[PDB]
Amino acid sequence: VRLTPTMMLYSGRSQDGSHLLKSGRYLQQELPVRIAHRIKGFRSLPFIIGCNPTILHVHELYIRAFQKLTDFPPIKDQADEAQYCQLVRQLLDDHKDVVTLLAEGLRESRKHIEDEKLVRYFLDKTLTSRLGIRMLATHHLALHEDKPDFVGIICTRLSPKKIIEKWVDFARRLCEHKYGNAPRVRINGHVAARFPFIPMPLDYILPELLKNAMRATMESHLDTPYNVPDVVITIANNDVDLIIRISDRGGGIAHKDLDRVMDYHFGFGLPTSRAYAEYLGGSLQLQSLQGIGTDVYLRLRHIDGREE
Amino acid sequence: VRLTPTMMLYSGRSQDGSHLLKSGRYLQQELPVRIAHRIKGFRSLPFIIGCNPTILHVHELYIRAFQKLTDFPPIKDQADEAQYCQLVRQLLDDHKDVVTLLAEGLRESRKHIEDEKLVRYFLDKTLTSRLGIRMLATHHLALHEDKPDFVGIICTRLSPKKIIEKWVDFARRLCEHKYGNAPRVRINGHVAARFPFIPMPLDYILPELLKNAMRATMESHLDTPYNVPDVVITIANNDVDLIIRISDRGGGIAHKDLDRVMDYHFGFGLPTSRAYAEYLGGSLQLQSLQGIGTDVYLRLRHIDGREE
Ligand SMILES: [Cl-]
Ligand SMILES: [Cl-]
Ligand SMILES: [Cl-]
Ligand SMILES: [Cl-]
Ligand SMILES: [Cl-]
Ligand SMILES: [Cl-]
Ligand SMILES: [Cl-]
Ligand SMILES: [Cl-]
Numbered sequence A, B: 001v002r003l004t005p006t007m008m009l010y011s012g013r014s015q016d017g018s019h020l021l022k023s024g025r026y027l028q029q030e031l032p033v034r035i036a037h038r039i040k041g042f043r044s045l046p047f048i049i050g051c052n053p054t055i056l057h058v059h060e061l062y063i064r065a066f067q068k069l070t071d072f073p074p075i076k077d078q079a080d081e082a083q084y085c086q087l088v089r090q091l092l093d094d095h096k097d098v099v100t101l102l103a104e105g106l107r108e109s110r111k112h113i114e115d116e117k118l119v120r121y122f123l124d125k126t127l128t129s130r131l132g133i134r135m136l137a138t139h140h141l142a143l144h145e146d147k148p149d150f151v152g153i154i155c156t157r158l159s160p161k162k163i164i165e166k167w168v169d170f171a172r173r174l175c176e177h178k179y180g181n182a183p184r185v186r187i188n189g190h191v192a193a194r195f196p197f198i199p200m201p202l203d204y205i206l207p208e209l210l211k212n213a214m215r216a217t218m219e220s221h222l223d224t225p226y227n228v229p230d231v232v233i234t235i236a237n238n239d240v241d242l243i244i245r246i247s248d249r250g251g252g253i254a255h256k257d258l259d260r261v262m263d264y265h266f267g268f269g270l271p272t273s274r275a276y277a278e279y280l281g282g283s284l285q286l287q288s289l290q291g292i293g294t295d296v297y298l299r300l301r302h303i304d305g306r307e308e
Helices: A019-043 A053-071 A078-094 A098-108 A117-142 A160-179 A199-219 A269-279 B019-043 B053-071 B078-094 B098-108 B117-142 B160-179 B199-219 B269-279
Strands: A154-158 A185-189 A195-197 A231-237 A241-248 A283-289 A293-301 B154-158 B185-189 B195-197 B231-237 B241-248 B283-289 B293-301
Touching (some): A019 A053, A019 A078, A053 A078, A053 A098, A117 A199, A160 A185, A160 A231, A160 A241, A199 A241, A199 A269, A199 A293, A241 B283, A269 A293, A283 B241, A283 B283, A293 B283, B019 B078, B019 B117, B053 B098, B078 B117, B098 B117, B117 B199, B117 B269, B154 B160, B160 B199, B160 B231, B160 B241, B199 B231, B199 B241, B199 B269, B199 B293, B269 B283
Parallel strands (some): B185 B231
Antiparallel strands (some): A231 A241, A283 A293, B154 B195, B231 B241, B241 B293, B283 B293
């Protein structure tokens, strides 16, 4: 029964399978409202932008999603709950390319972009609500599985080091295939911490931050790709939050670019990651040392409490 | 002929000693105006606060300083210039304890402090104007000396590493005398950079930042004072600015204190340092990793240009 931005993830008495209906009935109430808020979002978009064929397509997806959800009858038994899970799965799949479609749509509407903020905000709101929905949906679905150390999508004993390492491997491979090598990554600080945490956010953010740190490093060592500065990550775990600092020695972010780094370039990783972090009660801050490198600070608040 | 916040430091053709009069006549025009602005500052202070005997004393010092400066006749020859230097030296000495007097005065007026901002701002404005005056005064006086690599207070080839080391030594001694030991300090990055720079700001800021980093380290290793984590400093020198990052592993600044750290506690080092940095076109940012340590970023803009 953890919490987030009005979203609530349930953890309850299985056996009877009663917990699945209390969760499903909640998911059934919540999804329509969140889908509706996004539809309003598309309705308030500047006419010229909302007219773009692609944007107009994504808008129709939200409308059709709202219809299917509103058409489903109230969950009364485990029989309905099961079918409702099928609807939800169809939706997540139907909206798998929403973000790609938006980028394409907004890119084409770049010439008409008058207000710079009312686009950064539209993408923030769209990407986050989409994360909140995926977390709510995925959690309920996960309540049907029985993985060890997981109550839905909530890991009861997550290891920041473990998850960071997973993505380090992922990121290093993409890097080697692209440059012939990749920076090793050292991890210090609270390397042995373990606590209840929802990995999903970290599953998106970390690989975005790790690819950036590794790229900057390679792009600034074109003369010695076979010998580059390590990327150093530090884990700070306290009762209020989890802090992961990712430091690279890739030259830093030039003064002339310090602004456009956090904007979308249909570069989505950094702006999306900050949105995600802020949506969850955390933050994403950059410290640039021009000529040397960059320090990125990812802060995420702990699960409805304080643990280490 | 370098620049700053409307302040201008002169560098010119000696020999004739003509450069000393063009500088003196400028210093003579500038000091009264800056002293006057501060007097207005004391006049706009809330009556209850400005009534404190001590605060009232400091206020009288500014008034008497303004009088002496306004009484001095226009500099016409090297003879006047020389005497004017004597006036200036008397002033800097008469106002040597201004800050200590203010703290004492404001501390006593703590009960009456209604507005929290209009005090932080009064101390900012008082401490900075005081720095700007000391830089203007000291520079002109320094134009009489003939030190190597110095045009007044402007060092023509300052070494951040060199100046940092000087203060590391200073800070380590105070630390050992207080704890029996002190963290070693490693310095990386652009350790060989050299460029025109005014050391004064760094002469105050660095020892304040270095004492904090060393203190936090000792206070969080009371069980092993003989073996503590190094303090690590990184120098980033580019064409726009000089960045000195000071990282300690002293536990960081607790969430509950993150606000009061940048306030005055009549703790003056951090708030004064940020004021100084901002006054000079730079900044002072803190990144706290609760449970691990703190990273402090000092940024100072280069002398009327771009060098490395
Ligand atoms: Cl269009
Ligand atoms: Cl999704
Ligand atoms: Cl890559
Ligand atoms: Cl530790
Ligand atoms: Cl009083
Ligand atoms: Cl002074
Ligand atoms: Cl000390
Ligand atoms: Cl280097």
